Amino acid sequence: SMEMDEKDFAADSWSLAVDSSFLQQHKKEVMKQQDVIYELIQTELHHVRTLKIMTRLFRTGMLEELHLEPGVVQGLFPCVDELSDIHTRFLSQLLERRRQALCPGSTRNFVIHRLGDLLISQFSGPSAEQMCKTYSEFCSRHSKALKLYKELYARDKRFQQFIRKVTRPAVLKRHGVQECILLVTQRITKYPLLISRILQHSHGIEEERQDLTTALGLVKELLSNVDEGIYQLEKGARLQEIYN
């Protein structure tokens, strides 16, 4: 992540991120809705940061420093480029919606009144098809990626030294190769929890309550489709095992 965005999301909540004199001007219900919206963006920034560690630090680091067999690096980080593109675009729109909402003369005081429209766009049409396609593929290759990681760490000395070296910094404490893969898989199921709590505090405007209710239903339809398209791939799985 970039420093501009890290500072905007360093606070534990929206009520702590905005100026105290700006906060005082708002009703409690707005503050509560804004806190959950801030959490949705902050965790999306962290999710995008996880995907950059997988592509730039791990994947590219392995390609430019190790002599692994062709196709090994793809098996360790499946669909990471497609995933990073999907989520960097969604984060871009979330951050642009916050920036348009800033008060003049301020880089921290904002209120997001419209969010449902953006969530309906993300979880509908071709963007929903690409997320469904990419997560079904990713989550079916999850087990095979972990097993491949365990084989390489146990047998190759240069792979073990590479991993120990790039994950040694404290900022990487909870971001190893296996942690990144579970962090990515778990992400999709966090959206209905976040959207339902935003909806809980968005009854003031009827259009907003309806857009969020639609977006919630779209996310659940996507999660149900991803879940139905999953079948764990095994390295060296015979055909007889697959069709039985």
């Binding site: 534990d12 909540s13 009520s15 702590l16 806190d35 959950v36 959490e39 965790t43 962290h46 989550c139 999850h142 087990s143 972990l146 404490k173 909870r174 296996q178 942690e179 579970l182 962090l183 898989t185 778990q186 999709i188 199921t189 966090k190 209905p192 929890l193 976040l194 709590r197 999660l223 149900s224 991803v226 879940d227 139905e228 999953i230």
Partner: protein, 178 residues
């Protein structure tokens, strides 16, 4: 320092996310309680041994039977949560969660944890439950369930008051080590 993986399982309103947050922050959030928990790596020293314990949640994964098991690979200790203000969450333990945890995590120790023990003395809790011919889960009922399912142990805590939270994770570390 060895690396151990803990996964917390349980029904939606069992309070598992709140338990992980209060432990990871090491206090009850005063300004905003987060909706979600990503992950955390705890630095714990139990009985002289230093362990790096990775903390994970299954929250949001309850209706997704093919997504949920992806949280189980390489687990060293399972926290099986239920809410003391919800006797129906305890009934789901032996027929819903226990068969799943034992298939995907064979031989892994399970600690049955009763959350929200503070609500055992809440008057609104007792009144709401009596309207459905119910009462808060008694300590002996929790121990009997932990015994019936073959749990490593039975523990109780209150994430709101922080009571018994440090002890559940120190014990989980010990179970992961055996």
């Amino acid at each position: 320092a060895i690396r151990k993986k803990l996964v917390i399982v349980g029904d939606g309103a069992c309070g598992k996310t709140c338990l992980l947050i209060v432990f990871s922050k090491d206090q009850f959030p005063e300004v905003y309680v987060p909706t979600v928990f990503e992950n955390y790596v705890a630095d714990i020293e139990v009985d002289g041994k230093q362990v790096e314990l990775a903390l994970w949640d299954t929250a949001g994964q309850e209706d997704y039977d093919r997504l949920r098991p992806l949280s189980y690979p390489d687990t060293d200790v399972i926290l099986m949560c239920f809410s003391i203000d919800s006797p129906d969450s305890l009934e789901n333990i032996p027929e819903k969660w226990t068969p799943e945890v034992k298939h995907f995590c064979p031989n892994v120790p399970i600690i049955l944890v009763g959350n929200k023990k503070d609500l055992r003395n809440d008057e609104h809790t007792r009144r709401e439950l009596a309207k459905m011919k119910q009462e808060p889960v008694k300590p002996e009922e929790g121990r009997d369930m932990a015994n019936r399912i073959g749990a490593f142990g039975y523990m109780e805590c209150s994430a709101k008051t922080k009571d018994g939270v440090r002890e559940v994770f120190e014990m989980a570390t010990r179970a992961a080590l055996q």
